[PDB]
Structure 1
Amino acid sequence: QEQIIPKPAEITLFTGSPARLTPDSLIITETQDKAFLDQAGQLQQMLSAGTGLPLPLKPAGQASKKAACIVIKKDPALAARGEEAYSIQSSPSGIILSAADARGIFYAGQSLVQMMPSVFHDRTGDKSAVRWNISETPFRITDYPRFSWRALMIDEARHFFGEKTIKQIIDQMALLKMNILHWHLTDDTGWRIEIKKYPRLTSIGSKRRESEIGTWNSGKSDGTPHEGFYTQEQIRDIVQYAARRNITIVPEIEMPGHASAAAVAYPFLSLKTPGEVPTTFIVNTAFDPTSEKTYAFLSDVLDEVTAIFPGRIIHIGGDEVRYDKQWKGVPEIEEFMKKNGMKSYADVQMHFTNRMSGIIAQKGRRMMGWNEIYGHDVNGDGGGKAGAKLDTNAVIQFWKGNTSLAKNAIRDGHDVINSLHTSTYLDYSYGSIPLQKAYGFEPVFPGLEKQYHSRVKGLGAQVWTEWISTPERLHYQAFPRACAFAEVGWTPAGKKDFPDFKKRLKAYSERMDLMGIKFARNVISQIDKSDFFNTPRIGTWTPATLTREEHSFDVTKLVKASGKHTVTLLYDKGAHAIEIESVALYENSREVSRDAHAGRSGAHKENIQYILNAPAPRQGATYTVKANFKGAGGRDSHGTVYFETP
């Protein structure tokens, strides 16, 4: 029936006909709050453009008993659930969108879209024949996010994509109710933010001769110059574009590592500045933490960043400082450490990180960084452990290391965002991080005491672009796994259901097509062993039982009602698959249903699910599933037979 991603927190369905939008439908606002009237205005534009319906804005009371109308209410009952909470009440009488804060109305509108025909997103065609039903029945939805930090990071430093591409991704984020765009705009191989005071950051740092391709240390190169950067006016436009879709942009200025591009523009910023912007993705230059000129330079850059990014939080990265390749044995470093009594290179970075944390605070902002800023050497570069402590107000994004280190940071008073890279790096392949691993990700670190759970503010999924040079390849890596992380961030843990998610994702993919998203096609419709973890097992097959091609499984205790019962023959192990001819249901000793279609259950699964029509059970009778199958080229085969009721 209803198929929204993310699955809402609370829903109640009723019997009867659904609400339907028609050319006579109106959008009524039962409040004069200036923020709600704005949300209603763009809701009108958005819904009108997609349906082709007029949907005029009219004042409270001008409702027509001819068509169902959208009514926008301000209800403070939902304040306890946060500013993103909303409620939807839908019936042929009317569609009521309520929220304590105007942000909730926007999210109520996105859910409304996901309950209407997907042709809403089609840029062409005659929509006048379309029935704009809101789901299939009357219903009430009460919805709110589990986590407040639901982030997607786009790496535009490795490869630049530009305004048109980034807005297309913002459109997907908003439709999935992800609310933070983590914008990774500077790195070794590119600088993408116009800085008025330091024009060489873009005139030099935004251009490179060529790019390594294939993978790290491939020896391959495209011999193709690559350049691009955002003007400050372009950033203001994108910030506003995202803010209207409930998305805050968190910019990242990488430091003190990942600084090659910045250094080539102004070489005094690093003790080992390269001769040109690197054309490989393993070269990692570090800023000079011992020089006063670097902090002054970075404070100025962050001043212009603060002018164009209104968000409270500023990311500075701090990951993968190559201590031994950049700082060890450098006289400036060694003298600085003795002068300041520092014993390890982590102390050098901590001095840098704490000093930047104060600089950022004096601009009315909050520092955020990768977990390397917390003191411990997680990369194996010879930096040791930091004696000093990180400013407790700094936010830590945990990508690499033993999770006990992240729990330690939480217990020391830090807010944390979980981006464990073995689960959230969307630049990895579907073999390294399958869709199922993404959906199963749990941001709250296992073993963390309940009192500390509030410090886990959410998650971030990262799209690194070393090996992504086009929007279509960006889509392939980011979707559909980003859809899963959207649900991890929003849906309550108890309501999560991967088999159901996979069904809803098949419907959602219709929208991604019409919106131009070249998601990975082979990943959505997959059968996995975990789908049947809670499903009754009615039998198995072994090399012994494969001496027969006729197999009987009792299901008397399981046939309790008429309807569709699904038999799944799932291969477990063995050299050979089984060839399946048919599966049938018997009432006592007589056939009452049979699904005869060719199936093959092995390493690959093709048509392994058989649908049986059970009658209303006969009291006292036995019910038996009879499956006709043989080994395919051999008998070394093991598998399990599952039985799902309607």
Structure 2
Amino acid sequence: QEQIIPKPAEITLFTGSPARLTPDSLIITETQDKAFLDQAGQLQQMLSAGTGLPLPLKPAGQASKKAACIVIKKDPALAARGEEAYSIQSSPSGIILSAADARGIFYAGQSLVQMMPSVFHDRTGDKSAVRWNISETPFRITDYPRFSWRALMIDEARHFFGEKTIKQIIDQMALLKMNILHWHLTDDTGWRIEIKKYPRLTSIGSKRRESEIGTWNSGKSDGTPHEGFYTQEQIRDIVQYAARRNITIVPEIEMPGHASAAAVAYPFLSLKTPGEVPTTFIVNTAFDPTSEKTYAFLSDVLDEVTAIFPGRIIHIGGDAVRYDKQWKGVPEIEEFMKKNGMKSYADVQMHFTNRMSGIIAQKGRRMMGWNEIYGHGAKLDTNAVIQFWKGNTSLAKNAIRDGHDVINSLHTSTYLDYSYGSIPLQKAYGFEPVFPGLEKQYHSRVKGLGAQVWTEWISTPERLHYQAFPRACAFAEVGWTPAGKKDFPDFKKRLKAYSERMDLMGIKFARNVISQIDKSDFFNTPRIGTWTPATLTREEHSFDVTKLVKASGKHTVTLLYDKGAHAIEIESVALYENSREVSRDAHAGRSGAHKENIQYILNAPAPRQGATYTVKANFKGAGGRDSHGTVYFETP
């Protein structure tokens, strides 16, 4: 049925047969705007490669007749919905793609691919036999993002991955309509940008002798040198590759902290420069806030950043320095503080980060940073963007009420380096970027969200995939789909289909995740009973569903363990019409810490007026009766 991730804003389904691309189908451009023509050509190349169909570009050929073509239109009425909005009208007569801005057409194409057979992505095989149907019926889609900032961050400073890997990540982002690549390119353990005025930033800072592994303070090492960096020509190519796929790159140059690799290259940049690039991930060196050379150096670097990154926003990091380890007691710090009348080390960081916002602004750019740039001593430039990642949400809300745009990256929801125990798939999908205590008038200041793939413990592309996917798919939906249309069980079904595409595209996403059952699948589902140690003193259990049996069809009963030392063993679940059985699903299930076949399918008859309907479930405690659970009843 409907399988697009993100789920689009407005969908209208019609009855009949769907559109199908054939060897006779054409792509017609009914506009002269060349931005739309460039998108049309890029759309032709993509669709032809994946389907094998020729799909040549023509403004003529009429619209054939019984050969559904692709029509690209420029519809001004969608402009109220932003430059990323588009509409799709699909029927056997035609497939019309419209947008106010050319970027909408690209996203229309991605929706088109996701409504076609997944084999589109196969690099092998006979595709001349595929039925290239667009969904299962005719339809009208009007679509647009809830949030304008839908970001994925890749940390290449902790471990470098390179052009091939990041282009493959960009491909996943575009297919999910994520539009910001936050590129964390500098940190203590690596510097990954060629700066032509300062060659040692890469010739020294891009190489280290070994890497700590396992976890922080593991005492374990791989004893393996690690190096890599991007040349400025590579960065230009990747910027272009991303922009063609509707993605703006936000570069991050960490400061005043996370500066070890830069300091080793040029030791005057820090008051406590390490002897070599750190081999452990527990070292955080800080730039010297008391020497103009620091600011002069950083401004020269930022000059080259702006020449090769056209995006308006530059991320400085700006998270808190480890004051005790780095500045406390250093004479250059204490005198600097006494002179300028500063009471705290945090005041010294605020001074640095405020000065950098003026340096960034004088380059025609806009500064972004982690929420410490805002506070907790003068105040920060109102134009600065704040990425919230930790603390009381009152800090983000205070910044919003003071006039800052905010990106919600609360680390307990969005840090993809964490395990699936720490952030399960349902926690990623249930993330709500708009802080709940924030008054409605302020909501438009929450521009969106960012998911972070930190790479201390990620050294291969396949491990990067394992950590980033499938949860990045959830964040793409949180960023795009209207809040009122979010639906976690439905998202997980669509995720199964989408996981075929990830396989064919080489993405080693986490396996044991997509098909789990969690209690969050059932907030929108009726509850018909429970079990307790007391109800386990019998094995036959009856639950009334009279009010829920309104029509013929399939009903799914789920016995979901909640807590207790013991699971339940389930023999069968049946539906009774009055006192007679009319459907039974007999199969062994176990609902406890592990959930094994806990869903039972019941076939309801067209209801008998005046009859009662009862779900009867035969189950008992497994090794004991300390078991609590809930019985859910789905009526699709």
TM-score interval for Structure 1 and Structure 2 normalised by the shorter chain:
over 0.9
Structure 1 residue 180, shift from structure 2 partner: 0.3
Q: Deviations over 1:274-302 (max 9, x none)?
A: 11000011111111111111111111111
552-561 vs 6-15, which deviates more?
A: 552-561
Structure 1 residue 558, shift from structure 2 partner: 1.6
Asked if the contact 1:5–1:504 (Cα under 8 Å) also holds between the matched residues in 2, the reply is yes
207-216 vs 526-535, which deviates more?
A: 526-535
Q: Deviations over 1:467-490 (max 9, x none)?
A: 000000000110111111111111
Q: Deviations over 1:505-526 (max 9, x none)?
A: 1111111111111111111111
Q: Distance in 2 between matches of 1:454 and 1:572?
A: 38
Q: Deviations over 1:434-454 (max 9, x none)?
A: 111111111111211222212
Q: Deviations over 1:228-249 (max 9, x none)?
A: 0000000000000000000000
Asked if the contact 1:210–1:279 (Cα under 8 Å) also holds between the matched residues in 2, the reply is yes
101-110 vs 348-357, which deviates more?
A: 348-357
Q: Distance in 2 between matches of 1:416 and 1:549?
A: 54
Asked if the contact 2:66–2:93 (Cα under 8 Å) also holds between the matched residues in 1, the reply is no
Q: Deviations over 1:340-373 (max 9, x none)?
A: 2222112211221121111111111111111111
Structure 1 residue 539, shift from structure 2 partner: 2.4
Structure 1 residue 271, shift from structure 2 partner: 1.0
Give the 3-state SS of the residue equivalent to 1:253 in structure 2: strand
TM-score, normalisation: structure 2: 0.98
Identity %: 100
| Aligned residue number for residue 470 of structure 1 | 460
| Aligned residue number for residue 525 of structure 2 | 535
Q: Distance in 2 between matches of 1:621 and 1:450?
A: 48
Asked if the contact 2:66–2:92 (Cα under 8 Å) also holds between the matched residues in 1, the reply is no
Asked if the contact 2:389–2:410 (Cα under 8 Å) also holds between the matched residues in 1, the reply is yes
Structure 1 residue 540, shift from structure 2 partner: 2.4
Instruction: Give every structure 1 segment of 4 or more consecutive aligned residues whose post-TM-superposition deviation is greater than 4 Å.
Output: none
Give the 3-state SS of the residue equivalent to 1:523 in structure 2: coil
Give the 3-state SS of the residue equivalent to 2:390 in structure 1: coil
Aligned runs of 1:51-66 on 2, under 5 Å?
Answer: 51-60=51-60, 62-66=62-66
Asked if the contact 2:426–2:520 (Cα under 8 Å) also holds between the matched residues in 1, the reply is no
Q: Distance in 2 between matches of 1:374 and 1:620?
A: 65
Asked if the contact 1:242–1:249 (Cα under 8 Å) also holds between the matched residues in 2, the reply is yes
Q: Deviations over 1:530-556 (max 9, x none)?
A: 222332222222333323322222222
Asked if the contact 1:30–1:60 (Cα under 8 Å) also holds between the matched residues in 2, the reply is no
Structure 1 residue 622, shift from structure 2 partner: 2.1
Q: Distance in 2 between matches of 1:498 and 1:480?
A: 13
Structure 1 residue 60, shift from structure 2 partner: 4.7
Q: Deviations over 1:11-46 (max 9, x none)?
A: 010111111111111100000101000000000000
Q: Distance in 2 between matches of 1:545 and 1:349?
A: 61
Aligned runs of 1:165-184 on 2, under 5 Å?
Answer: 165-184=165-184
Structure 1 residue 640, shift from structure 2 partner: 2.1
Q: Distance in 2 between matches of 1:311 and 1:639?
A: 52
Aligned runs of 1:200-349 on 2, under 5 Å?
Answer: 200-349=200-349
Structure 1 residue 144, shift from structure 2 partner: 0.4
Structure 1 residue 331, shift from structure 2 partner: 1.5
Matched, 1:151 2:141: no
Give the 3-state SS of the residue equivalent to 2:368 in structure 1: strand
Structure 1 residue 634, shift from structure 2 partner: 2.3
Q: Distance in 1 between matches of 2:501 and 2:231?
A: 31
Asked if the contact 1:24–1:66 (Cα under 8 Å) also holds between the matched residues in 2, the reply is no
Give the 3-state SS of the residue equivalent to 1:369 in structure 2: strand
| Aligned residue number for residue 162 of structure 1 | 162
Structure 1 residue 596, shift from structure 2 partner: 1.3
Asked if the contact 2:545–2:613 (Cα under 8 Å) also holds between the matched residues in 1, the reply is yes
Q: Distance in 1 between matches of 2:400 and 2:442?
A: 7
Q: Distance in 1 between matches of 2:209 and 2:457?
A: 16
Give the 3-state SS of the residue equivalent to 1:198 in structure 2: coil
318-327 vs 98-107, which deviates more?
A: 318-327
Q: Distance in 1 between matches of 2:391 and 2:619?
A: 48
Q: Distance in 1 between matches of 2:336 and 2:531?
A: 71
Q: Distance in 2 between matches of 1:410 and 1:19?
A: 46
Give the 3-state SS of the residue equivalent to 2:18 in structure 1: coil
Asked if the contact 1:566–1:645 (Cα under 8 Å) also holds between the matched residues in 2, the reply is yes
Q: Distance in 1 between matches of 2:575 and 2:519?
A: 24
Q: Distance in 2 between matches of 1:421 and 1:541?
A: 36
Structure 1 residue 61, shift from structure 2 partner: 5.7
Q: Distance in 2 between matches of 1:547 and 1:339?
A: 78
Structure 1 residue 580, shift from structure 2 partner: 1.3
Q: Distance in 1 between matches of 2:274 and 2:24?
A: 66
Q: Distance in 2 between matches of 1:77 and 1:226?
A: 53
For structure 1, the residue ranges without an aligned partner over 5 or more in a row are 377-386
| Aligned residue number for residue 577 of structure 1 | 567
490-499 vs 635-644, which deviates more?
A: 635-644
Q: Deviations over 1:197-237 (max 9, x none)?
A: 11000000000000000100111111000000000000000
Q: Distance in 1 between matches of 2:232 and 2:224?
A: 27
Q: Distance in 2 between matches of 1:88 and 1:308?
A: 35
Q: Distance in 2 between matches of 1:550 and 1:449?
A: 50
Q: Deviations over 1:366-394 (max 9, x none)?
A: 11111111121xxxxxxxxxx21111111
Of 593, 609, 617, 1:627 maps to: 617
